[PDB]
Amino acid sequence: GLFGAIAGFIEGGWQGMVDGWYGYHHSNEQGSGYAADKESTQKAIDGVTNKVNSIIDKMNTQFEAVGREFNNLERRIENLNKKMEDGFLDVWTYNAELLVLMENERTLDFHDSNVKNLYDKVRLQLRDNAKELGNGCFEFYHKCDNECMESVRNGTYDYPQY
């Protein structure tokens, strides 16, 4: 993916994280677990929802065929009519298929970008107080209990404290 996170430096997803699209997994002496990042998830939900409603709505006005009959010596205009109606269908079929292709690609990259941004947001907090393992994880130099972990998820990781 364009942003390199999903199926990139983060090898795969988490069956175990059920309550959001992106989040954290922690590991300390007290235990381990998955916690969803609510802000980035909701952002992703709003964007994709608006994309779908945008797509549905732009396609709202679109060609409607109408039954039109012609006699045995009006073949030319019968054919003009058939061509005209078919032509618009082909145009609108193309618009629908291409839009879906193009936006699907952007939706996948959008998710990738959200993961990368959440990873960086964490990286930029921890700075040199943690080893960047290269797989999505940061190994702390200090011990980091559930309150410590929560502060990293907060946006609050007190760097001068550790």
């Binding site: 199926a7 269908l89 879906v100 996948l108 998710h111 999505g136």
Partner: protein, 321 residues
């Protein structure tokens, strides 16, 4: 101790296409193309279609005696006609500007048939002998019920000078016809006079038909031909007819009571005892999808038609194996 950033995965097998990659498995997806229908012709929001069955629009409107079912039909949502209805013009001929009239019915939901020239009204001509074996009814020779094939009386067809005034509020559709016989012998045998005409006038119409004699192939056992014409008589206008012979005179004409959104749908399907918001020639649609691929010719509140076999939007992200 560590903290990791990650993303959702699940057991989804839904797939979406992109420009660069086909069949990508995603955690969540949204189909937007309706592919199914109920295979039936249904009422459109409670309003039943006019199903002409084995009759054509011409057979219906002229009153082909095989089309009695459609004498005084109630309001309709749309009309359904077969590709080749067997009960069209029972006595062979042409229907003039037939396609333009059909187009006119795409904007009509209801006719109210009325008698403009009574059959008893013809005191100088024979009004009950204009029947053919090509238009049978219950074993006997009959004819288009809405027009009267007038013939001579005691070897005299005197000139006809009739008028009807459209006094009612609603545009009136008026049908008449002319008979084209096989030869000079048949002309005198039916209408006496050798050279005849039918003149027709309104505020806008200036017509004068003359019968056209020729030997033709038999169709339904008849080598003669009937040519049918029509006009729309506006309110407060009058139509005048003048004829020597060969005149197929109106008896009943159609009052255009309700105008609106209709369509002549072409289909072999019969009534399916159902209701729907969206009807197509192959069946009715019941969906919330923005698109469908059933048929381009729809009526009602419908999704938008595309030729696609598949339209699926990614909502979620790339699902892990």
């Amino acid at each position: 101790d560590q903290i990791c950033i990650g993303y959702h995965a699940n057991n989804s097998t839904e797939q979406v296409d992109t420009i660069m990659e086909k069949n990508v498995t995603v955690t969540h997806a949204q189909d937007i193309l309706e592919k199914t229908h109920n295979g039936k012709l249904c009422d459109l929001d409670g309003v039943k279609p006019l199903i002409l069955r084995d009759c054509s629009v011409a057979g219906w409107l002229l009153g082909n005696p095989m089309c009695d079912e459609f004498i005084n039909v109630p309001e309709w949502s749309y009309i359904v006609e077969k590709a080749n209805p067997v009960n069209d013009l029972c006595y062979p001929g042409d229907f003039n500007d037939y396609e333009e009239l059909k187009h006119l019915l795409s904007r009509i939901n209801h006719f109210e048939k009325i008698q403009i020239i009574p059959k008893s009204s013809w005191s100088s001509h024979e009004a009950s002998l204009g029947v053919s074996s090509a238009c049978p009814y219950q074993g006997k020779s009959s004819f288009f019920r809405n027009v009267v094939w007038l013939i001579k009386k005691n070897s005299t067809y005197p000139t006809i000078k009739r008028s009807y005034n459209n006094t009612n509020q609603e545009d009136l559709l008026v049908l008449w016809g002319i008979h084209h016989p096989n030869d000079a012998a048949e002309q005198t045998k039916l209408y006496q006079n050798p050279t005849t005409y039918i003149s027709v006038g309104t505020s806008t119409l200036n017509q004068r038909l003359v019968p056209r004699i020729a030997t033709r192939s038999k169709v339904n056992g008849q080598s003669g031909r009937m040519e049918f014409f029509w006009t729309i008589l506006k309110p407060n206008d009058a139509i005048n007819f003048e004829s020597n012979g060969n005149f197929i005179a109106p008896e009943y004409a159609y009052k255009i009571v309700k105008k609106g959104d209709s369509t002549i749908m072409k289909s072999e399907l019969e009534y399916g005892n159902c209701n729907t918001k969206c009807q197509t020639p192959m069946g009715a649609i019941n969906s919330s999808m923005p698109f469908h691929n059933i048929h381009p010719l729809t009526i009602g509140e419908c999704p938008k038609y595309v030729k696609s076999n598949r339209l699926v939007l990614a909502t979620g992200l790339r699902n892990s194996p």
